[PDB]
Write a protein that binds this ligand. Structure first.
Ligand SMILES: [Mg+2]
Ligand SMILES: [Mg+2]
Ligand SMILES: [Mg+2]
Ligand SMILES: [Mg+2]
Ligand SMILES: [Mg+2]
Length: 224
RNA sequence: GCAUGGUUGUCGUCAGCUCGUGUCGUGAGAUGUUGGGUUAAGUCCCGCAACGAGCGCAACCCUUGAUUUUAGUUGCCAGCAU
């Protein structure tokens, strides 16, 4: 339900270098600009509605949603939007086999919870200096990595990614577990590997914000 | 002692040897254990399709080098006479 002028002001139509485009995106290309491909904004607004409509019923049952923000330009732009949805998100680094090997990652989550509970009530000054400093460094180490999904209880029902060229691991292991993926793609990504493709520029903070905001405020009410 | 249990030397106190789940390959297999510095050491951190763990490395043990308290005999003799 995002008007075309909003996207145009967001600079969404921009596409990557002409020398480095994926031919399957020819259906989404509009009058190649100087060294730059420009995409159909009408197709974009058509796809935004479809993704909006889909993402409702996966959380209508108070389900779970996992966002992925590996790209630098979308790191904070997804933390700021997952909190208002009460959902799970990944930043920094995507641990190999986060979804296929959920048992070991869950055990690491339990370890992190134990470390969190270590200092709340009990005593650590009894432990020597090396022990407490090593535990502090350890807890920062697996807090930066895991972060959100800390309270994640069970496998997700949908995914959200920014650059399906940069998290090949995420889509590769999400197609194996048969759970759908919605994400924005550039003029060089793979359409057929994403169920609900949405063509947009991924290199602009504004471009990712104007879509992740629509994703966030379309799930705040769906739970009710 | 080429049928064995037990015990021992050697590579060598060299720093390596593997596993569970995950992933790649039709298959034997592969990653983790490779890449950068770093150290006596897969010791440490960073990076990464891997996440962790186990036996070794290191630490816990004995001795030598300084010092406080209690203890003064058969030990010592500064200050006391023989
Ligand atoms: Mg023999
Ligand atoms: Mg090997
Ligand atoms: Mg050694
Ligand atoms: Mg090395
Ligand atoms: Mg070790």
């Amino acid at each position: 339900v995002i008007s075309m002028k909003q996207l145009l002001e967001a600079g969404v139509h921009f596409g990557h270098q002409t020398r480095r485009w994926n031919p399957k995106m020819k259906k989404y290309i509009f009058t190649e600009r100087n060294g730059i491909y420009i995409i159909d904004l009408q197709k974009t607004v058509k796809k935004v509605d479809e993704a909006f409509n889909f993402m409702r019923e996966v959380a209508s049952d108070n389900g779970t949603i996992l966002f992925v923000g590996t790209k630098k330009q979308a790191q904070e732009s997804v933390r700021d939007e997952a909190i208002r949805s009460g959902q799970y998100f990944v930043n920094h680094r995507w641990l190999g086999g986060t979804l296929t090997n959920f048992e070991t990652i869950q055990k690491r989550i339990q370890h992190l919870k134990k470390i969190e509970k270590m200092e709340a009530d009990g005593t650590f000054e009894v432990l020597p200096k090396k022990e407490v400093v090593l535990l502090k460094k350890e807890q920062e180490k697996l807090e930066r990595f895991l972060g959100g999904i800390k309270d994640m209880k069970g496998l997700p029902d949908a995914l959200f990614i920014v650059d399906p060229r940069k998290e090949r691991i995420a889509v590769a292991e999400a197609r194996k577990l048969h759970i759908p993926i919605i994400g924005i793609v550039d003029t060089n990504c793979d359409p057929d590997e994403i169920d609900y493709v949405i063509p947009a520029n991924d290199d602009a903070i504004r471009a990712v914000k104007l879509l992740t905001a629509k994703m966030a405020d379309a799930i705040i009410e769906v739970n009710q």
